[PDB]
Amino acid sequence: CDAFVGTWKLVSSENFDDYMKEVGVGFATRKVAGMAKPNMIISVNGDLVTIRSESTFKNTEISFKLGVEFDEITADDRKVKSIITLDGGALVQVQKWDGKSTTIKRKRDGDKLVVECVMKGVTSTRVYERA
Amino acid sequence: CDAFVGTWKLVSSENFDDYMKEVGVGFATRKVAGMAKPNMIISVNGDLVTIRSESTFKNTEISFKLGVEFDEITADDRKVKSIITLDGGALVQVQKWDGKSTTIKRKRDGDKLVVECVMKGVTSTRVYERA
Numbered sequence: 359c360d361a362f363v364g365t366w367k368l369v370s371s372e373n374f375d376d377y378m379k380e381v382g383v384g385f386a387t388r389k390v391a392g393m394a395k396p397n398m399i400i401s402v403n404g405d406l407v408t409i410r411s412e413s414t415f416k417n418t419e420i421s422f423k424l425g426v427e428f429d430e431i432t433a434d435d436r437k438v439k440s441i442i443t444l445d446g447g448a449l450v451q452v453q454k455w456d457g458k459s460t461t462i463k464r465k466r467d468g469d470k471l472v473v474e475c476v477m478k479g480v481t482s483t484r485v486y487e488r489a
Numbered sequence: 490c491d492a493f494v495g496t497w498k499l500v501s502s503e504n505f506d507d508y509m510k511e512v513g514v515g516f517a518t519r520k521v522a523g524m525a526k527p528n529m530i531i532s533v534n535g536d537l538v539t540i541r542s543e544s545t546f547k548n549t550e551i552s553f554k555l556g557v558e559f560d561e562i563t564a565d566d567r568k569v570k571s572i573i574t575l576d577g578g579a580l581v582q583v584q585k586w587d588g589k590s591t592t593i594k595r596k597r598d599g600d601k602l603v604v605e606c607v608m609k610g611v612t613s614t615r616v617y618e619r620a
């Protein structure tokens with residue numbers, strides 16, 4: 359996933375508050391989240407890929423091997439089981455918790471990194487450019 | 490309620506999608522609603538006050554006597570019991586349905602009409618100016 363390595367800064371977001379509503383995130387956290395303009399830092403070391411999101415409010419960090427299910431605690435504090443695979447040049451993440459699931463796809467589009475989040479038919483698109 | 494009579498056009502809205510989420514309005518109706526820039530027409534005839542909201546998508550109209558509870562079917566199709574009183578120069582509306590309630594206050598502020606909608610601690614403010 360060499361095309362993903364770097365530091366990325368958020369440029370635009372579409373429907374992210376609707377996505378968070380569908381995921382069940384509360385009002386106060388949804389308002390903090392929409393004020394954040396996180397930076398995403400992706401790095402690879404051997405077999406382990408690390409994705410870090412940094413903001414004034416909350417930093418998150420996950421390190422994983424592609425194809426191996428792992429425990430993740432999301433920024434909104436859900437404890438989920440995640441698995442990320444490399445498919446068609448995109449990182450596809452599925453998170454499962456309480457009988458629910460959501461898909462987060464990170465893909466390159468031109469010189470940008472695009473994050474698509476889908477929860478029960480609601481789709482959010484967030485576009486990042488290199489910092 | 491002479492200070493309210495006229496045709497008013499929406500100028501700004503704050504937190505209305507969050508208010509609709511709290512009321513339980515579905516995704517598609519919330520998206521149509523946020524695209525509408527309704528005109529509000531208020532008129533008085535004898536004892537009956539009429540408030541009409543017009544948009545490309547949905548027109549609603551309620552006629553009522555201040556202080557008398559009546560049946561209303563909202564734009565998002567809830568069948569509610571409403572009562573509107575005149576208090577401190579503002580029209581205060583309470584809608585009750587399924588053991589829930591929400592308050593909609595319509596008040597004058599300078600040359601504007603302000604609508605405040607409150608559902609369980611989430612507040613939306615919509616400002617109208619004369620058309």
Ligand SMILES: CCCCCCCCCCCCCCCCCC(=O)O
Nearest residue numbers: 383390391415416433434473475484
């Ligand atoms: C006080 C906490 C402040 C930060 C809150 C962030 C809350 C985000 C809740 C929903 C997380 C959804 C999963 C991440 C979706 C992709 C986000 C991204 O990388 O742009």
Ligand SMILES: CCCCCCCCCCCCCCCCCC(=O)O
Nearest residue numbers: 514521522546547564565604606615
């Ligand atoms: C297809 C329907 C298109 C129009 C949808 C409008 C849906 C609005 C749903 C919520 C109604 C809340 C009550 C009205 C709140 C005050 C609105 C206002 O006068 O600005």
